[PDB]
Design a protein around this ligand. Sequence first.
Ligand SMILES: C[C@H](CS)C(=O)N1CCCC[C@@H]1C(=O)O
Ligand SMILES: [Zn+2]
Ligand SMILES: [Zn+2]
Length: 229
Amino acid sequence: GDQRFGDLVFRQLAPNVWQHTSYLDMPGFGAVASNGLIVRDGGRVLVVDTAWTDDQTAQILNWIKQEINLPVALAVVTHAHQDKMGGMDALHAAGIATYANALSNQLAPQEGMVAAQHSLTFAANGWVEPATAPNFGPLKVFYPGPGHTSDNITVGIDGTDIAFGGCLIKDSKAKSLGNLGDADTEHYAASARAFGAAFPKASMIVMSHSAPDSRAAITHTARMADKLR
Ligand SMILES: C[C@H](CS)C(=O)N1CCCC[C@@H]1C(=O)O
Ligand SMILES: [Zn+2]
Ligand SMILES: [Zn+2]
């Protein structure tokens, strides 16, 4: 079920995996939900994406302390927009090591974000260069190509059926891809397909702006991105 904790919502997805959800009144769009992940790996916790704000991100850390009560070893954030990186200062205040695509860190100042402390780089095939993601445990980080933004990255969780598409993937009944001012309209469709191909056995697709869905989310996104080229 949806566990309400202050203004945030937490949902367990697997024995060691939870979805965090936070909301921001974005004028003209309503109160917009954004999802990220919390993963327990043995005696430590790994976070995927901040909440929209520092205060909300501190509340994620409070929930972790209450429900898991293990240290947060690292966080990885999936592109330089507010829903994914808006709470970076809260993670830094807590002493948590932070990681993002090198390009997200480069873009962070102009997008209004604080950069992560460490930069990920990626091989030509999209998989993270392993030395840039040390001690990531079950998190498998993949750059699918430019799409929702130039810098968007995705994360699979080893030992589960879960892959996280962030804001690249929309649910199987979404009817648009949202704002495309930062989107790569030429390459969006290929990038969405590359994410599905990188995590071929993931049956639960977690995304930023819809509840978890089947693999039909990936093909519907790619179909709609076909219409931007
Ligand atoms: C702050 C987020 C970063 S993805 C954002 O800008 N959006 C999400 C919610 C709807 C509007 C807009 C979009 O259509 O992409
Ligand atoms: Zn975005
Ligand atoms: Zn988003």
